[PDB]
Amino acid sequence: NPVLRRPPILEDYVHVTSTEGVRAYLVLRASSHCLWVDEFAPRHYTELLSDDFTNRCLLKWLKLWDLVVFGHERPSSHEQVLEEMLEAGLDPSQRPKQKVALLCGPPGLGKTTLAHVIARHAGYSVVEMNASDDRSPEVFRTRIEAATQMESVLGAGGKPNCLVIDEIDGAPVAAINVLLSILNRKGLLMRPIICICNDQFAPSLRQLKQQAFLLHFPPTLPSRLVQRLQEVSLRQGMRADPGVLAALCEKTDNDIRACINTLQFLYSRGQRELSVRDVQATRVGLKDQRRGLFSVWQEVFQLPRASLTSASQRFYRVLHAAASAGEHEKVVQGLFDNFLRLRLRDSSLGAVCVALDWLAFDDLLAGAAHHSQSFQLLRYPPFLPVAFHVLFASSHTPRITFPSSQQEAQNRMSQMRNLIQTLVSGIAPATRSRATPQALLLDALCLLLDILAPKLRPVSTQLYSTREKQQLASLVGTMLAYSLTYRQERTPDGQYIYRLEPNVEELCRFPELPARKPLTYQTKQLIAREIEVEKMRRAEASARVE
Amino acid sequence: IEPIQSRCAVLRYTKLTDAQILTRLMNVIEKERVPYTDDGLEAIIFTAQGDMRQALNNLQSTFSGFGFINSENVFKVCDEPHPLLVKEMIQHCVNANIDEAYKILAHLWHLGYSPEDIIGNIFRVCKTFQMAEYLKLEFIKEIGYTHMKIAEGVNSLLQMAGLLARLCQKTMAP
Amino acid sequence: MFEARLVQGSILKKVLEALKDLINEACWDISSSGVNLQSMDSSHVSLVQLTLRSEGFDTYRCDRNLAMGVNLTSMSKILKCAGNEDIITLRAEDNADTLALVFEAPNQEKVSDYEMKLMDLDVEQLGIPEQEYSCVVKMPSGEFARICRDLSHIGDAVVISCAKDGVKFSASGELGNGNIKLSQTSNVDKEEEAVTIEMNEPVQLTFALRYLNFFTKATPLSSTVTLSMSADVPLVVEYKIADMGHLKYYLAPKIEDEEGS
Amino acid sequence: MFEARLVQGSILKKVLEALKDLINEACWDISSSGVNLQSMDSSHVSLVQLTLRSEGFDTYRCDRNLAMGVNLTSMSKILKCAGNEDIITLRAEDNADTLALVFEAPNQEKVSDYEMKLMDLDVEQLGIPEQEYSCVVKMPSGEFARICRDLSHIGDAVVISCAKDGVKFSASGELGNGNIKLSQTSNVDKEEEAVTIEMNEPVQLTFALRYLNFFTKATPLSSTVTLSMSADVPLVVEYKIADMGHLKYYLAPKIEDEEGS
Amino acid sequence: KIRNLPWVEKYRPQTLNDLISHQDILSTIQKFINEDRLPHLLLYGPPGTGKTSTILACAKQLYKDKEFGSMVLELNASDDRGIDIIRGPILSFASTRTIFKKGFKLVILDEADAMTQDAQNALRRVIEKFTENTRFCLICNYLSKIIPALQSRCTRFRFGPLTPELMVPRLEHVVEEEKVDISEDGMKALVTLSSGDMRRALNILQSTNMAFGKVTEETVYTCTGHPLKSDIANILDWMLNQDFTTAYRNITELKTLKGLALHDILTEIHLFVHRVDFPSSVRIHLLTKMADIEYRLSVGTNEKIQLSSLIAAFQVTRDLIVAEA
Amino acid sequence: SLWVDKYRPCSLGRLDYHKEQAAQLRNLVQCGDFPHLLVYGPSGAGKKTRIMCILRELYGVGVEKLRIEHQTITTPSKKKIEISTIASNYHLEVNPSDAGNSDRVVIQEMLKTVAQSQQLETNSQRDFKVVLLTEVDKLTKDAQHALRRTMEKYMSTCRLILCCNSTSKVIPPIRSRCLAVRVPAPSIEDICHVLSTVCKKEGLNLPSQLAHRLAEKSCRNLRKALLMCEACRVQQYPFTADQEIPETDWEVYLRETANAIVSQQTPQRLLEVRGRLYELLTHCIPPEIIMKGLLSELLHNCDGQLKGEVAQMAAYYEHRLQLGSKAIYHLEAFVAKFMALYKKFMED
DNA sequence: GCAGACACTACGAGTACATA
Ligand SMILES: Nc1ncnc2c1ncn2[C@@H]1O[C@H](COP(=O)(O)OP(=O)(O)OP(O)(O)=S)[C@@H](O)[C@H]1O
Numbered sequence A: 001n002p003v004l005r006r007p008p009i010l011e012d013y014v015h016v017t018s019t020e021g022v023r024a025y026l027v028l029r030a031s032s033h034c035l036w037v038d039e040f041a042p043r044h045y046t047e048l049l050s051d052d053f054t055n056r057c058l059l060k061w062l063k064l065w066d067l068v069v070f071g072h073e074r075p076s077s078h079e080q081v082l083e084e085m086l087e088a089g090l091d092p093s094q095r096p097k098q099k100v101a102l103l104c105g106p107p108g109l110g111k112t113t114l115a116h117v118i119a120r121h122a123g124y125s126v127v128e129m130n131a132s133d134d135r136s137p138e139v140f141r142t143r144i145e146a147a148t149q150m151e152s153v154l155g156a157g158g159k160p161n162c163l164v165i166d167e168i169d170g171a172p173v174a175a176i177n178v179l180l181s182i183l184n185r186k187g188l189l190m191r192p193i194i195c196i197c198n199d200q201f202a203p204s205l206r207q208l209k210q211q212a213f214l215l216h217f218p219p220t221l222p223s224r225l226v227q228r229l230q231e232v233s234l235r236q237g238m239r240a241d242p243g244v245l246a247a248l249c250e251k252t253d254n255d256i257r258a259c260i261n262t263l264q265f266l267y268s269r270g271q272r273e274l275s276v277r278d279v280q281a282t283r284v285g286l287k288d289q290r291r292g293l294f295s296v297w298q299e300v301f302q303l304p305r306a307s308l309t310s311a312s313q314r315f316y317r318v319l320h321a322a323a324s325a326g327e328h329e330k331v332v333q334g335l336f337d338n339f340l341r342l343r344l345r346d347s348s349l350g351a352v353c354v355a356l357d358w359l360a361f362d363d364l365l366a367g368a369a370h371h372s373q374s375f376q377l378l379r380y381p382p383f384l385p386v387a388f389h390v391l392f393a394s395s396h397t398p399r400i401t402f403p404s405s406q407q408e409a410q411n412r413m414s415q416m417r418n419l420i421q422t423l424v425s426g427i428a429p430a431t432r433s434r435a436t437p438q439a440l441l442l443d444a445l446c447l448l449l450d451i452l453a454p455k456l457r458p459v460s461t462q463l464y465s466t467r468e469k470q471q472l473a474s475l476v477g478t479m480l481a482y483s484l485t486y487r488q489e490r491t492p493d494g495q496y497i498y499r500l501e502p503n504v505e506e507l508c509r510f511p512e513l514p515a516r517k518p519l520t521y522q523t524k525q526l527i528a529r530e531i532e533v534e535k536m537r538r539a540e541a542s543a544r545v546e
Numbered sequence B: 001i002e003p004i005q006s007r008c009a010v011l012r013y014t015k016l017t018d019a020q021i022l023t024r025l026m027n028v029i030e031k032e033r034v035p036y037t038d039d040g041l042e043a044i045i046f047t048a049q050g051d052m053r054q055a056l057n058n059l060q061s062t063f064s065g066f067g068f069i070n071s072e073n074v075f076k077v078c079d080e081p082h083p084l085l086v087k088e089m090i091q092h093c094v095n096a097n098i099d100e101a102y103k104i105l106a107h108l109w110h111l112g113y114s115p116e117d118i119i120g121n122i123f124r125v126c127k128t129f130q131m132a133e134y135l136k137l138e139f140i141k142e143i144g145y146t147h148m149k150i151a152e153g154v155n156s157l158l159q160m161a162g163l164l165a166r167l168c169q170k171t172m173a174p
Numbered sequence C, D: 001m002f003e004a005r006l007v008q009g010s011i012l013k014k015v016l017e018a019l020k021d022l023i024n025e026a027c028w029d030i031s032s033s034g035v036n037l038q039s040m041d042s043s044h045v046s047l048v049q050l051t052l053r054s055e056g057f058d059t060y061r062c063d064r065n066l067a068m069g070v071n072l073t074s075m076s077k078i079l080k081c082a083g084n085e086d087i088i089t090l091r092a093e094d095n096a097d098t099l100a101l102v103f104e105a106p107n108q109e110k111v112s113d114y115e116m117k118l119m120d121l122d123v124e125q126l127g128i129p130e131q132e133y134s135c136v137v138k139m140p141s142g143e144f145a146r147i148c149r150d151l152s153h154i155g156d157a158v159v160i161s162c163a164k165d166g167v168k169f170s171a172s173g174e175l176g177n178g179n180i181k182l183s184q185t186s187n188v189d190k191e192e193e194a195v196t197i198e199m200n201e202p203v204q205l206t207f208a209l210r211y212l213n214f215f216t217k218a219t220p221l222s223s224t225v226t227l228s229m230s231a232d233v234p235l236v237v238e239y240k241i242a243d244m245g246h247l248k249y250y251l252a253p254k255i256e257d258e259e260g261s
Numbered sequence E: 001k002i003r004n005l006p007w008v009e010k011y012r013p014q015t016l017n018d019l020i021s022h023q024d025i026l027s028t029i030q031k032f033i034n035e036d037r038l039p040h041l042l043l044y045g046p047p048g049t050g051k052t053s054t055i056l057a058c059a060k061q062l063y064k065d066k067e068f069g070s071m072v073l074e075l076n077a078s079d080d081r082g083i084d085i086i087r088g089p090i091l092s093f094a095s096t097r098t099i100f101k102k103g104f105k106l107v108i109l110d111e112a113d114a115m116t117q118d119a120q121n122a123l124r125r126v127i128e129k130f131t132e133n134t135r136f137c138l139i140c141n142y143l144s145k146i147i148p149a150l151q152s153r154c155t156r157f158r159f160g161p162l163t164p165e166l167m168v169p170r171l172e173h174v175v176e177e178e179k180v181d182i183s184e185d186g187m188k189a190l191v192t193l194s195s196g197d198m199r200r201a202l203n204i205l206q207s208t209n210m211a212f213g214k215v216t217e218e219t220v221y222t223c224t225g226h227p228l229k230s231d232i233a234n235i236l237d238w239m240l241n242q243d244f245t246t247a248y249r250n251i252t253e254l255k256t257l258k259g260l261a262l263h264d265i266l267t268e269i270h271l272f273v274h275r276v277d278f279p280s281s282v283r284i285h286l287l288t289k290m291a292d293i294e295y296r297l298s299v300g301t302n303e304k305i306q307l308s309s310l311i312a313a314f315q316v317t318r319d320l321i322v323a324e325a
Numbered sequence F: 001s002l003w004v005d006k007y008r009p010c011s012l013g014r015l016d017y018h019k020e021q022a023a024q025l026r027n028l029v030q031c032g033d034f035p036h037l038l039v040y041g042p043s044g045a046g047k048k049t050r051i052m053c054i055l056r057e058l059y060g061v062g063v064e065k066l067r068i069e070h071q072t073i074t075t076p077s078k079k080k081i082e083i084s085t086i087a088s089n090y091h092l093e094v095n096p097s098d099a100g101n102s103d104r105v106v107i108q109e110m111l112k113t114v115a116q117s118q119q120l121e122t123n124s125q126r127d128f129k130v131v132l133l134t135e136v137d138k139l140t141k142d143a144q145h146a147l148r149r150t151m152e153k154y155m156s157t158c159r160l161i162l163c164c165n166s167t168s169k170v171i172p173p174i175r176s177r178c179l180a181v182r183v184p185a186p187s188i189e190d191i192c193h194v195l196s197t198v199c200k201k202e203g204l205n206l207p208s209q210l211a212h213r214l215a216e217k218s219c220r221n222l223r224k225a226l227l228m229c230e231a232c233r234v235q236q237y238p239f240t241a242d243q244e245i246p247e248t249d250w251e252v253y254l255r256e257t258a259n260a261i262v263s264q265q266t267p268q269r270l271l272e273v274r275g276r277l278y279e280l281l282t283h284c285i286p287p288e289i290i291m292k293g294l295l296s297e298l299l300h301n302c303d304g305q306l307k308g309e310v311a312q313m314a315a316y317y318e319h320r321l322q323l324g325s326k327a328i329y330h331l332e333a334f335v336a337k338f339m340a341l342y343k344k345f346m347e348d
Numbered sequence G: 001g002c003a004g005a006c007a008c009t010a011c012g013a014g015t016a017c018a019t020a
């Protein structure tokens, strides 16, 4: 016991006394020349490893250019929109209405191979423009003008040019604007252009997706890739079971190039038979995959289906997937916008409270790191998603939506601040200093709108009384003081409406409030006409005084 | 990026073990005629932490400074690793044993380690520690809360002791 | 009705560039004598006066004492679209709320009309005392611009001294002092190069550099420049712009240090 | 009291434009013999030894010996606004910080007194060996500047060799190699364009092109340059100014390792 | 001759024999110099332990005064050390040989934790490639701000805090060189308030000798403003022995009379509570409350309310300690 | 012109309340060596009116002739920011919080240029210029730490009248450098007297019952009381003692938000309340006022042994909101904590 | 001898990010 009733004999002691006065004492003291990915590359349409629907759609889209390019009438869900646009017809310029084919997908699927094989199969000559070029908006422009606006220098019998633009997701936005301006010259584009990217949701390609024949590559079928790897290994004289090749295809996430490179390293010539433990080992063939946002939200919110059943492995897997995805703010926004839509089992709201505590912890860490320039604090918010995985992991199938609430709120707040500035700048500086815009918004806006809307009968000015004339004069005076007026606005229904010039009703009114009676069209037109008349009379009085 | 990793064979090297570094150290010792004991070579392996550069640097430093490789001559110039000693303090904080945790903290404080290095080692141990996951998240949140105060400017022994006391509080607060 | 015509379009194209970054608006006072502009800056340091008499215009119509207030952020963009040697007519109605500038296009094939909204500003005349200055000197305009530009690479503020010897510019900074003097330049062929002294009492005052550079942005309007100073009166920089009128600049000094004992 | 007087301003402008991107700060060592300046570069790779004689100045007085460390960007800004035909006075007191540069405007009317503040660098004196070199080459400075500019387009490090035949330049770059070898060009009407070989033992050394291109900016100072090379002592570029003094540039060779094979 | 210098700059250990504490490290570095086997060094430790003095003594021992400007490239946090500097002057200094005499060169990077990680990643092959031509010495206070690739390439020496037993003779040398009358309690107060830092020891010695003319315990604790051990013992006894009002009055009178600050009182009370044999639940509460009070003092907060909370943190635990029995 | 601006007093002798403070402020600024002022009090108490009365006392009647001046300031990131300024020929009025976190760039560069320069006309203008920094409690601490040496060095030729609502957000170095002038809110009798005087100057008759109800509903805000009285005449000129007084929309929306919090305690109700809180944050309502209105309406539904815990939670999450940057996290955390506490109290 | 054209570097400007 640390507390002794008797005082110590040898060691020094510290007294402790209670409120009731009881004393205690404590102690103070060319087979060998080329790669296998180039030796086994497809040289024909029948050797492709992509999805057959995407190959047929790209071939049909390129054969839709046969009338304009080759001068011949005869060439010889996600699926439904493509099959409709392939059968949608042609514009009166004898061209497809989708003149650009945008190719998207994860790396190593065969997009460049599909583009080159489909272009050389349809009688074109492949002109490539990839990320290793200068990609400035003038060099991009003159290269597209070279590739698409001229015929062949071989004369008759020369193949047409199919411009393949590889890695368009890394191009700047001005290059995409140059490409779209060339695409929309009405200078007419007479040759097909096919673009290849890896991430379709790039901010530079957002205008391109609305104008392109969007082909999204699914991951390759494991049975087809297993058969192709069996063909490659049997051509190279190496024996492997289909199970170890299926495990290798699982390891590389259906990447053809990574699997063939891993086989080329692992085979060599010391041994013939592949072993399962070589594929299962992380030394050869394991590369970092950048996870998608929806896959990360799905693996956070949903438990894996039934080793891997331990909670620590799920903890580390969720942490590493959320770290490897990147775009941390979007992950946090998706967690914030999706965690209350689940079938939550915590009816006492404790998990929601500690999740909001973790969100406030991330926000405080971001603020402290951006204030003190101490970014070693930025290693803790990567543990924000995995905390959600400890809180809201369920065996159900949650419908994860893309986060929009924070961005919509920020944009609407920016619009409200711009509207506040527009309202404030119209008033006179003699009365602008008497109230701050915050106090004007909180105190002097809804009451001001109640002042600006009296109960006025639809009666002309000659039949009005003296009191009603004085009330209308005070109304137009306080309307002119804040530089407000009513102006006509057209509607799709065909009826003219009258709206306040600085439309401050969206600043004042709230959606779920009880409704109030507005002014009619006649009295608002009378108010606007009296505002114009009083402005002209004020100008005349100022001219008479001066 | 993933296109470059798809375009290449991705070989991953693991951290070197004790016998693998010991073979190269025996080769260098037989080349350089360095007298040694087994305990001194074990101390060189201990200070190496899987790094051959640090093993060769520590062997060169000990042989130049003293001319003999035993445990005392290695530990006079080299240093014991940090996270193995931090892990014992984290284990004491898991069992809410504040006295031994403060003993390890004060030993690390009197060795001249700054609060930022100590809290970095504490976070790196608590990332891979073997405990409950919710308790691990509570520990990581408390570590980040203390590290914000360290980055603000208040970095004393009392602040690290308060961090240790809060980590011991997190154990006895279900 | 305000209706004025210019004889040269380069007067506005040299006088609005000095007021581009100096003052935020141009307030013109209309009278029978001419147009008067008195504008104080937002920091209450600089004061710009511009008096262009009615005898210098090609034509001038003024019935009532009116005041117009125009902005600079639109007039500066409008002036760059105008030509150089063309004619500029300014028009303003009695009751309208816009000012019209009519000139010729730089292609010299069409007439360009530009309208600007009249900002209703509520100002009052500060009132210069027009007192006897303790130092009056005359200097070349471009030489004064080169002098104010050469002290920009040294210090953020300049020191103007004026004894009977001449006018001394100083620039003390972290690099080192830059001192230049001009004295007795009557033995030159050009009459605009005459650096002369006119008063007796010496004055030493520290002024800003940015406002003096903005003052020397209006140098090819006139041939000579005049500098007036006193012990507490702000610095007066006078340009006699051709025949239509003149321009005055007032720059307040800086707060002196506590060098007493 | 220190008071030197550069007879024309062009030589100081050429000196301070040669050293502008090379020398961190100027250490003027002042004696009765003249003005000495031994300063290394910021990378501690090159060395500049400038010696101006007392007879080259207009008037030169020096009572006690000085060592003035001054900044170079400030002196570059001072000498930028200086003429090429006007006298420039360098003044310094016994225990002051003001190093005064007194000159005239390009308008040749007003004086200009630019002060600089002296630094305290107390750097130790670097010993020039002044030993004999195994290769001495007289060549024109413009040809040396042209060949350094031509070798800068191919590579970044240039192997310069010298033997009984002549000086040889090689630049093994990424495009390829450029090997330029010039000898016995004394058979022209000019006297500056000549290649002369004085010493015996061949040397091959590699140097950075950036420092050589910085050294070639002293071309308007001297029409003929001297190259001194040996296997141990560095590369010396010696410009002999006509009636003022001389300028020595010392550049250390790069570390080159042969292939193990 | 005499100069107007601070005593942390007037008395700098120009040779390696004048540094006091890290004898094994200094012997190893001296044998590195004598055998001409100097590696890339990484000197890390708390401030005021003698890392910059060590590398400057080594640079003065390795090179003469006639050649020191061509062999040593010293860069610190007051200089620009961006990636253009690593690819520029540092790489050209590493890749070229000397000017006057043959020898290996020395690049000193003082305060290397302030370098950006791009510059630290560019430093790696400069250090590895030109090892025979030039040597690198990194000096830092925080080892975590240096990348592990640079920590692999350098042999690291921990310059730990100066023990007060070895700290005494250097202070006695400074005292005898300045004609300072000091008592034994004054030297004990110097080595106590310094806490492994010779800079603050010499600064407190110079400040006390200028303020009072003598260096005793009273003069040191008055010039520093630090509370004495008896004052902290009285404060702890008042907090643990009597009620809130009497302890508040006594501590307020002691703080007003001697002009004490709450930060040093918190530091010494925190040092005291680990010595007093408290129960573990009491100690955790005391440490948490004192860390909260010390965090509250870092902003514009009234010190009287925080002193009342410091009294409150022990008045809570008084009954608990006594009823534990 | 509204009643808030039509009948505002011009001089210190025309104020209807705090007349002893008005005489003391007249005595303070008479000599001209008065220090920097920090006018603080609740909103609508009459701080700006007394500041303009002090300005009219110091200078002539030309203080009321105002103008708008726009100044473009360059940030250290070289992003140009335009800031408006109420100006006269004698004083300046800056609200630096309009530049947000760049407010320090307003203090370090735009203010010092005002302070370092003397007056052009020392006969019309006095020996000092006055700068009114509006809403200094909304300033960041960096701007307040940039303020202090400008206040100390140029006090003899540049005076400052800072204005705020709470002096707790002002750092102690700034509060040490200025004299703190407290303007309390007018009482119910003072607001009734002001409203009666305004109605009799307008030719109208105001009952004591309606004036007392306007003063009680205004929460001692004279601006809101005058606006409510003008809205009441507008909507019904014969002043009944039980005439319905109009109310602001965001207050009713906040009351219905708190009623929605009380009505259900479920994550779906938390989602709907989070939508209501974004609607409130979108309309530029400050989150501290959202917290205060939420507390003021949630305490009307709690029992006697829960209100202290609800108030402590509201203060805690308001403090965490001030320490953070995203207000919706702390607002929803307070609502979720209240829902958990209210469910625990109702079930047990 | 002086106007037109060539490439040269210095400088303004936009954007990303900062951890394990
Ligand atoms: N059917 C196939 N059989 C074997 N190898 C193939 C087959 N199809 C394609 N490949 C190879 O696998 C790789 C496919 O990748 P590519 O089409 O060149 O590039 P990509 O598919 O666009 O992916 P990224 O984003 O550019 S990395 C290439 O190395 C091809 O040679």
Ligand SMILES: Nc1ncnc2c1ncn2[C@@H]1O[C@H](COP(=O)(O)OP(=O)(O)OP(O)(O)=S)[C@@H](O)[C@H]1O
Pocket: E007, E008, E009, E011, E012, E013, E018, E019, E020, E021, E022, E045, E046, E047, E048, E049, E050, E051, E052, E053, E054, E140, E141, E162, E170, E198, E199, E202
């Ligand atoms: N070991 C020591 N022996 C003697 N004097 C010392 C010692 N350490 C420090 N000093 C004194 O303290 C002064 C500064 O020490 P430094 O060498 O700068 O220590 P430091 O390790 O570099 O501290 P930092 O980390 O750079 S702030 C020296 O000039 C000496 O006067």
Ligand SMILES: Nc1ncnc2c1ncn2[C@@H]1O[C@H](COP(=O)(O)OP(=O)(O)O)[C@@H](O)[C@H]1O
Pocket: A434, A435, A439, F003, F004, F005, F007, F008, F009, F014, F015, F016, F017, F042, F043, F044, F045, F046, F047, F048, F049, F050, F194, F222, F223
């Ligand atoms: N003494 C007074 N007599 C009559 N009305 C007043 C008086 N003081 C203030 N008011 C009115 O009350 C309102 C208070 O607003 P303001 O003066 O801006 O104070 P605050 O700055 O505290 O909001 C003003 O609109 C003003 O017209």
Ligand SMILES: [Mg+2]
Pocket: A111, A112, A166, A196
């Ligand atoms: Mg590709």
Ligand SMILES: [Mg+2]
Pocket: E051, E052, E110
């Ligand atoms: Mg140091």
